[PDB]
């Protein structure tokens, strides 16, 4: 299973995209690392852009299935989200490279990305309609801001380290602040 | 318009698009119309060059928009305005985070003081009871900054979620302020 060519390319692609981004990624390196010929990569994914889009989409589905947005347990959702990122740092890294490469332009799998968010937003909205979470802020914006506080530390680990100190006492302390902040934001 | 100024500018542009490891001194020299040796004469080495360039952009923002506990919403407005007008800062900060991770920074001491000052401004606001103290000053500053800057890290998520163009940008702005208030309100 993990020996299948498609699986090897997938994994090598992740590693390569994670380090060098989309433009800096080298198909040759991916091929070498996957012990697969360059033509095989194109046979399974068509082109570099499609390959990145596919790899990213899969990691996102994994997180979406493992940690669905849950308005009835904001704190538990935050805990699971933080745990996942710590256990799988490739996702956020790929997301950053994508943001840098495409900026505000349409994405290769634009439609699929739209649905991805429409579902998460719906989970937030449902919580608003049921009055479990504030509706002072729109559902999408609300989801975005909660995600911002949970992932910011990954973007600037030097800022986190210097502001809350290294060591578990800081990570854990921060996790606690994120949850207290999320509560104040969604309450009522 | 001296050469040190040209190198600085070229360095910014270079670091902004290629990061620290991917940055090329030759490119910076060519773009600055300055010999490679001159860059080392004025900044010593690539790492020192980056640290100097980043430190300067941060001092600029720090002086232009001080952490103000007595006007969190105005502070957020000015913060958002500044990043939109000077996108190099956040970009450089991301590259730095990716390059050093959790390791000591070249100008570690200077960075420490930088944050100690911002933290102090939030603390002061807590001590005066203008801002909640349910959350520690440092963490409080961090979370506020997170909401303000996350959109620049993932422009695609912002665009899809709150809409692109001025409508989306202005809507997120309002939400950021409302969220910040709920977080700090004593």
Curated annotation (Swiss-Prot), chain B:
Residues 1-61 form the HTH tetR-type domain. Binding of a wide range of cationic hydrophobic compounds to SCO4008 causes a decrease in DNA-binding, probably via allosteric conformational change of SCO4008. InterPro entries: Homeodomain-like_sf, HTH-type_TetR-like_transc_reg, HTH_TetR, Sco4008_C, Tet_transcr_reg_TetR-rel_C_sf. Induction: Autoregulated. Residues 24-43 bind DNA. GO terms for molecular function: DNA binding. Keywords: DNA-binding, Repressor, Transcription, Transcription regulation. Contains an N-terminal DNA-binding domain and a C-terminal dimerization domain. Probably regulates the expression of its own gene and the adjacent SCO4007 gene by binding to two operator sites in the SCO4007-SCO4008 intergenic region. Homodimer. Four dimers bind to the two operator sites. PANTHER family: HTH-TYPE TRANSCRIPTIONAL REPRESSOR SCO4008, TRANSCRIPTIONAL REPRESSOR. This is HTH-type transcriptional repressor SCO4008. The lineage of its organism: Bacteria, Bacillati, Actinomycetota, Actinomycetes, Kitasatosporales.
